[PDB]
Design a protein around this nucleic acid. Structure first.
Lengths: 58, 52, 105, 122, 191
RNA sequence: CGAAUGCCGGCAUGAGUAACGAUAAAGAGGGUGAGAAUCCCUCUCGCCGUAAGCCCAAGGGUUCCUACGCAAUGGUCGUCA
RNA sequence: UCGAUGUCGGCUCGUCGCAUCCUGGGGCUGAAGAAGGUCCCAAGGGUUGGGCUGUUCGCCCAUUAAAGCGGCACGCGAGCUGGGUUCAGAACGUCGUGAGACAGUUCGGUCUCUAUCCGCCACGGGCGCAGGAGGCUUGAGGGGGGCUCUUCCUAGUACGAGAGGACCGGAAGGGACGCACCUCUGGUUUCCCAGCUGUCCCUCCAGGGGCAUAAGCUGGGUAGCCAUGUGCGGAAGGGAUAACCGCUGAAAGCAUCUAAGCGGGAAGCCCGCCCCAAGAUGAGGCCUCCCACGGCGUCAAGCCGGUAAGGACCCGGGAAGACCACCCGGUGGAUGGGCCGGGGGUGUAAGCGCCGCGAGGCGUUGAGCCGACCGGUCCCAAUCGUCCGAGGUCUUGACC
């Protein structure tokens, strides 16, 4: 029942543009509180456990 | 009145009025009161101003 | 619906068992709203409140447990008996931001 | 309200019993009978042919409707029913005496005859 | 600022002689901001700070008496609007969103043998074969809720200051309370 | 030999949009792992229940247990099969 | 066009056009009035429910101002419809020895998920507008929206035999329609409250519990959303004109609106109302604020800290919402949830208490439990951190 399926090949080029608009952006991250390492902005880690409270492990 | 009877009451410094053929009436209030009343027998009604 | 409750249920429960838990962002936040108000009745303390909170979590051990157990610890505040804190990791395949929440202590 | 075939009843001895709307009078567009308005429609069933008779072609004015009409008194009114009166073009009822109670409306929009005969008015 | 403005209080109505509904509006005198004039070269808007204490958190009649209080030193109470006259008022929509041919625009859909049939809402058609392709016509699902809206003959009845507030005839202020509404009075017919 | 809606075989398309095979649901705790929403124990809960029961046979035919182990099969995982 | 363009009628969405049905402006009558009829000008808006018929069309019903003609493959099937004629049945009538057959008829008879492009509607991603900035407008251009009936004074006066019934001019009401909106009214209100049977767990009672859909059921129910409902609008008024009517006056020393000169006059055109809008590359205005960091070969208009001028990310929240972007908050907080006070909703709880063997009843109670609505207070959670982001191109001239 394929009423409409593309009529033309798609243009290598353009095709890719389409893809184009699409951009990767590494998670903003910030250095630790004191477990000194880099971390996911805002959170404890297998480095930390702090924040202001010792909740976590290792 | 009493909502006619409808010992209950409902809606503003207005309230509102419902009625019946034979130049006779249904002065009005609240839903509960409503359906029961429109449907069957006064004196058997209970809640409000008569089974009071 | 049936579900919303369900959850609020098992969770509220285990939660009281633990004082903290791992669910996902929202999961946590509302588990908060409610396990919380439950807590508040825990405070209320009495025939009635007891009745309600059980009405939902269903079970004595804990029911009273919360009630006589921690209700005290908190009897004083103004809600907030819960503190939800965002987690640093995401469950796989998924990518979901889990979180950890507790009863503030 | 009350157009197309909605049925409604008498309250005047005009000789009816009941009628099915047709037209909601007034002028094109238009779709509603409501106390005061005037409907065009007719006999579904009339008594032993008093003077009207079943399936008879008629015009009449709107007198009692549970569509609840609002009065410029931010106050509200509705009836356990739907009925009215028949007329001679010259907006006059035919039914010699009235029936169910009516609303100040009639006077308003021109229907004394009725107005007075009325067992009651609200 | 050429005009008079404020926000959405709420609507209710009560009293009068029969009984009329209205809406209340909020506004003491949201201060002076330059003063419209293509004089000597282009002169349009200036800002000799005299502002809030927040606002660097972001950093010829009508307008003329606006020169009056603007010069005064910023603000200028509202209610020039008096005992029932007609402003008019703009209000931003109310973000309704992206919708169906339906409420986007009154249109009968799926008649009955099929109104239902797991079939409903979706405008009916687009364009004759031979005329060709597509108008810029027939709207489409044309979002609503952010439109800048407003109307005419806005009769305002009364006001009072228990805070600078107005009571205007027939709400329809567009947006919801706690929202931005502006009023002028222009080209009155019911002048 | 473009060139026969060509035969053979690779290789791109839409396209990272469409689908996951019944709207009988999940959630928490701990356990094991290099790594587990997707395995193990465990406590909340939902669904059958005339069946989503156990049985005889038909058909298939080692698929079964037990220790190992995961490259592909398993429409994601997967230390589970 | 047969490696294929899907043929009726309907539907829904419509868009021209005029020979215009209704509208307005006209000149004409065998026009007094009034209403008619003749044609010219004008497409603004507007141009109803049934009825029977697969129908278009048509006939009839009741309205109306009207109930217009025709274009777009007799517009629309990658949008439905699919009644039909126009797949095998089959049926009759009807031809034909027959066989099948008939634009004669009659009963039934599988119209296919995923839009590439252009296109349209919406929402952001760039980059530009040559300092770097946050906030304010102007709008050329563009879009919406333009109807109408009745009632009344002017008058029952102009006309008039009379029954009638005015221009001109002005009040009101309503229709259908569009913008927007909850107050009022009505619908909602998937768990807010309340009554319920059947069942399994609850520990026996009571007092609950899931399931009885994805609320089992019923009786009700904010807030938002939304009519059936609230406010509203289609106008004045100005500028050029259509038809059409005049003045002034030749050429025809006598007329003529007339080529040149001036005005009269349309629901029309332009403007006015409202709605966008300089990505109108002719990047517009204005104000506010930030000042020339570095060291590298040069018309170094190329690479580094920057200025919180500012903004951004993350987080927290919105009738803001698919994403996105938009807007307000970010513990010098009230932003979200919590709590709390209020309404508003259910209708007097769970317990003991008393009257009746029981059923229950009445009390303690208008109680109890409460989802968004208004507004407190730092109970909880918006910590802390990071990025990027200017410097002022070349030439002419006007001033200090």
């Amino acid at each position: 029942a394929k009423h409409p399926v593309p009529k033309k090949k798609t243009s290598k080029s353009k095709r890719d543009m389409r893809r184009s608009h699409h951009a990767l952006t590494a998670p903003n991250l910030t250095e630790c509180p004191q477990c000194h390492g880099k971390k996911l902005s805002h959170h404890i880690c297998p480095n930390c456990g702090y924040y202001d409270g010792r909740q976590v492990l290792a | 009145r009493e909502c006619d009877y409808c010992g209950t009451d409902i809606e503003p410094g207005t309230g509102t009025m419902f009625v019946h053929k034979d130049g006779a009436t249904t002065h009005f209030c609240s839903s509960k009161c409503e359906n029961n009343a429109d449907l069957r027998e006064a004196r058997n009604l209970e809640w409000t101003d008569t089974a009071r | 619906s049936s579900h919303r409750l369900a959850l609020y249920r098992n969770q509220a429960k285990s939660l009281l068992t633990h004082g903290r838990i791992t669910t996902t962002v929202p999961k946590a936040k509302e588990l908060r709203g409610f396990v919380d108000h439950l807590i508040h009745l825990a405070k209320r303390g009495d025939l009635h409140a007891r009745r309600l909170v059980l009405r939902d979590l269903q079970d004595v051990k804990l029911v009273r447990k919360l009630f006589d157990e921690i209700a005290p610890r908190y009897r004083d505040r103004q809600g907030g008996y819960t503190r939800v804190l965002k987690l640093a990791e995401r469950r796989r395949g998924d990518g979901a931001p889990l979180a950890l929440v507790e009863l503030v202590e | 309200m009350i157009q197309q075939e909605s049925r409604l009843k008498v309250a005047d001895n005009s000789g009816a019993r009941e009628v099915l709307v047709i037209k909601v009078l007034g002028g094109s567009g238009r779709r509603y009978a409501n106390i005061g308005d005037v409907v065009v429609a007719t006999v579904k069933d009339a008594t032993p042919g008093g003077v009207v008779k079943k399936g008879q072609v008629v015009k009449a004015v709107v007198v009692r409707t549970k569509r609840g009409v609002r009065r410029p008194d931010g106050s509200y009114i509705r009836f356990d029913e739907n009925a009215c009166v028949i007329i001679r073009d010259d907006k006059s009822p035919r039914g010699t005496r009235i029936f169910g109670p009516v609303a100040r409306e009639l006077r308003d929009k021109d229907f004394m005859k009725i107005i007075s005969l009325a067992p009651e008015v609200i | 600022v050429q005009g008079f403005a404020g926000y959405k209080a709420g609507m209710t109505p009560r009293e009068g002689m029969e009984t009329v509904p209205v809406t209340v509006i909020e506004t003491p005198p949201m201060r002076a901001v330059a003063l419209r004039a293509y004089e000597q070269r282009p002169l349009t808007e200036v800002w000799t700070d005299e502002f809030h204490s927040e606002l660097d958190r972001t950093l010829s009649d009508r307008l003329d008496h606006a020169l009056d209080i603007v010069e005064d030193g910023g603000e200028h109470a509202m209610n020039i609007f008096r005992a029932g006259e007609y402003a008019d008022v703009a209000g931003v929509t109310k973000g309704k969103g992206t919708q169906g041919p339906v409420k986007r625009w009154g249109v009968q859909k799926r008649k009955g043998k099929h109104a239902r049939q797991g079939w409903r809402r979706r405008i009916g058609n687009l364009g004759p074969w031979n005329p060709s392709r597509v108008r810029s016509t027939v709207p489409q699902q044309g979002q609503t809720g952010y439109h800048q809206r407003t109307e005419l003959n806005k009769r305002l009845i009364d006001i009072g200051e228990g805070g600078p507030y107005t009571l205007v005839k027939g709400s329809v202020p567009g947006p919801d309370k706690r929202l931005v509404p502006f009023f002028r009075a222009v080209r009155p017919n019911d002048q």
